[PDB]
Amino acid sequence: SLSYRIDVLLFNKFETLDVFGPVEIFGNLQDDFELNFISSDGGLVESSQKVRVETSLYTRDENIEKILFVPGGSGTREKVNDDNFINFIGNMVKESKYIISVCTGSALLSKAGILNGKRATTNKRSFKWVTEQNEDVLWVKEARWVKDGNIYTSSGVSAGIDMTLGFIEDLIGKEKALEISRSIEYFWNEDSNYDPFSKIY
Amino acid sequence: SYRIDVLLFNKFETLDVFGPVEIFGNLQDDFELNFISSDGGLVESSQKVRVETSLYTRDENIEKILFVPGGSGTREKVNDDNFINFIGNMVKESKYIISVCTGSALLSKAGILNGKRATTNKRSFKWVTEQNEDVLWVKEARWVKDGNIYTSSGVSAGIDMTLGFIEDLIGKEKALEISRSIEYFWNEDSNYDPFSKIY
């Protein structure tokens, strides 16, 4: 048992990059993080771009600190209006130390009510859709990503990867995040505040 | 239009594969994604992602694109005479060949790169390059187009090359469209890899 378990939540029609860019970063700190791919049913889950990934069921541990990671994608359109799924998420949040979302994953966290009275963001293309669902969230329009306590939310796919490296900086130290960037040859925009895509909407 | 044969093997690099898949998979009227491996079934990435694959299958009703990622797995995989011949067999049959990272160590081993301009990630440049002196390796490039062959360096190069490929093949507007809808910041310059500096 290491320090952290990352519970990567997959569901039907998740966005491929929302999940895999961050995984590429977390999956390169294997003495720090236990990667756990979960979904409501276990088995293979298909992304919106047709990749099928093996997953398992969420299990509780008193024992290890848990980071819940919640991606976006088409599938949120229907997952928001699925009470049973939203209960699932809330169950998992109640138990996690850290909570991370990319894109419309924040719509799901919003529905679970965990972001009420919290600063958070979502991708710019879906900003209206997401935000108008919940007023009690201190939505932030322009940010690439927002940290609010132990909650980290981000916008589109670039922001989601850059946020993850930011999360590593916060948690493991910036020297580590840079080492990862350099070794996989990923260009990291450390600025979390100006999303150039906020512009066209 | 095209079937993209994305070749997985044990310990592939996750982002080598899923960055480009995000792009291609956003043009589902132009490309059909087909994840293959030598055995079929589940293949695991170096980051522990298990992805389902099928066996390669011949079709002559559709043009094919062969996509080859890098990752740790390539060090062992350059040895598989069969694997390499498998690739060559597939290359012989494809309209385009694309690689990211050490994927080009494998393309090279198939000798497909002999006489061609090509690149690979900067961190592994020595190791890849010394395997074959008959390839015209380009050190400073993020990616390199030589004919119907496209090779890329690191993970960001991998995605930006895929958008460049979409531009070449389908038109630049479609490329910008995708990048804007998924909100991916696309670095269009294929020429100066900042990671060349390190090595």
**DSSP states of B66-82:** EEE--STHHHHHTT-HH
- Asked whether the CA dihedral A26, A32, A33, A34 is positive or negative, the reply is positive
User: Which distant-in-sequence residues (6+ apart) come within 8 Å of B116 by Cβ?
Assistant: B135, B136, B146, B147, B149
CA angle, A110 then A62 then A90, to 5°: 15
3-state secondary structure of A178: helix
Helices A157-172 and A16-26 pack at an angle, to 10 degrees, of: 20
The closest CB to that of A35, out of B18, B48, B180, belongs to B48
Joined together, the tokens standing for residue B104 give 């080009």
Instruction: Find tokens 């209960």 and name the residue.
Output: A87
d(CA B168, CA A134): 42
- Looking at residue A124, its amino acid is K
| Homologous superfamily of domain range A1-201 | Class I glutamine amidotransferase (GATase) domain (3.40.50.880)
B44, B37 contact by CB (below 8 A): no
Give the closest-approach CA distance of A50 to chain B in angstroms: 7
Joined together, the tokens standing for residue B165 give 């490929």
- Asked whether the CA dihedral A24, A28, A33, A37 is positive or negative, the reply is positive
What is the Cα A37 distance to its own chain's centre?
Answer: 13
The closest alpha carbon to A100, from A151, A58, A168, belongs to: A151
- Asked whether the CA dihedral B118, B119, B124, B129 is positive or negative, the reply is positive
d(CA B107, CA B55): 19
Q: Which fold has domain B1-199?
A: Rossmann fold (3.40.50)
CB contact under 8 Å between A26 and B49, yes or no, is no
Which positions 138-197 of B are in contact with A (Cβ < 8 Å)?
A: 153-157, 180-185, 187, 193-195
B9, B43 contact by CB (below 8 A): yes
The closest alpha carbon to B66, from B119, B127, B125, B3, belongs to: B3
- Asked whether the CA dihedral B158, B164, B170, B175 is positive or negative, the reply is positive
Mutate to test the interface with B, among A178, A184, A201 (most CBs of B within 10 A): A184
Give the closest-approach CA distance of B156 to chain A in angstroms: 5
d(CA B10, CA A18): 23
CB contact under 8 Å between A54 and B45, yes or no, is no
B147, B198 contact by CB (below 8 A): no
CB contact under 8 Å between B154 and A185, yes or no, is yes
CA of B159: which chain A residue's CA is closest?
Answer: A186
Cα-Cα-Cα-Cα torsion B27, B110, B8, B127, nearest 10 degrees, comes to -110
A113 φψ region: left (φ > 0), alpha (ψ -120 to 50), beta (else) = left
B71, B11 contact by CB (below 8 A): yes
B171 φψ region: left (φ > 0), alpha (ψ -120 to 50), beta (else) = left
The closest CB to that of A17, out of B19, B45, B49, belongs to B19
What size, in residues, is chain B?
A: 199
3-state secondary structure of B169: helix
d(CA A109, CA A80): 9
Which positions 107-126 of A are in contact with B (Cβ < 8 Å)?
A: 123-125
A108-116 long-range contacts, CB within 8 A, separation 24+: A108/A70, A108/A76, A108/A79, A108/A80, A109/A70, A109/A151, A109/A153, A110/A134, A110/A137, A111/A80, A111/A86, A112/A86, A114/A90, A114/A151, A115/A151, A115/A153
The closest alpha carbon to B134, from B154, B112, B150, belongs to: B112
User: Which distant-in-sequence residues (6+ apart) come within 8 Å of A15 by Cβ?
Assistant: A47, A48, A49, A71, A72, A73, A74, A102, A103, A157, B22, B182
d(CA A23, CA B14): 8
